[PDB]
Design a protein around this ligand. Structure first.
Ligand SMILES: CC1(C)CCC(c2ccc(Cl)cc2)=C(CN2CCN(c3ccc(C(=O)NS(=O)(=O)c4ccc(N[C@H](CCN5CCOCC5)CSc5ccccc5)c(S(=O)(=O)C(F)(F)F)c4)cc3)CC2)C1
Length: 154
């Protein structure tokens, strides 16, 4: 899976997108693109989450854990995983904006731990990051179709 490198590479890019300096290339690039797609499609949620976080060093973990628990409460799908990356992105960007840059390493650790300890089994059972890339390439009708075909498979 190489979940930790995916995290670091992702955060390093969202922080470049904002101006600061901090597994196949296709996985990295596809995750970036999917993330930008999610943030455009769910632009109200993105902006509102940004506004409603109140990051301090003392509340960062509670904030992270609350949101991630809510995100995966009813189960996992690839879009929720993308929302998780985007959420982590937001936390990192606002950490730096607010001159709390120490949190960035913390958030990256929390994200890698969550992927390894709570998303790893799902990812493996759902075809790995290869199936993520495959789905991204498919149009919505194709994606719904391979979902029902994968269910009927195993
Ligand atoms: C409880 C709480 C407060 C918790 C906190 C929180 C929250 C708030 C702010 C922030 Cl910041 C973070 C979290 C919320 C907000 N909630 C979070 C969850 N939300 C989701 C909404 C939709 C889905 C979904 O749809 N999931 S999905 O069915 O699995 C799926 C479908 C399509 C594709 N991708 C296609 C790609 C199309 N191709 C492109 C290339 O040319 C060919 C066509 C469309 S783009 C695309 C479309 C959707 C997602 C990503 C990319 C992918 S995907 O990109 O991951 C892939 F395909 F799998 F790779 C997967 C999952 C969850 C709704 C908003 C709620």
């Amino acid at each position: 899976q190489d979940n930790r490198e995916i995290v670091m590479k992702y955060i390093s890019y969202k922080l470049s997108q904002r101006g600061y300096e901090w597994e196949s290339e296709v996985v990295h690039q596809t995750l970036r693109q999917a993330g930008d797609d999610f943030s455009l499609r769910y632009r109200r949620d993105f902006a509102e989450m940004s506004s409603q976080l109140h990051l301090t060093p003392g509340t960062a973990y509670a904030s992270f854990a609350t949101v991630v628990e809510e995100l995966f409460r009813d189960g996992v799908n690839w879009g929720r995983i993308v929302a998780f990356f985007e959420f982590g992105g937001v936390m990192c960007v606002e950490s730096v904006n607010r001159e709390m840059s120490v949190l960035v390493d913390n958030i990256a650790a929390w994200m890698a731990t969550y992927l390894n300890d709570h998303l790893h089994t799902w990812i493996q059972d759902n075809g790995g990051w290869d199936a993520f890339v495959e789905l991204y390439g498919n149009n919505a009708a194709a994606e719904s179709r391979k979902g029902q075909e994968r269910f009927l498979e195993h």
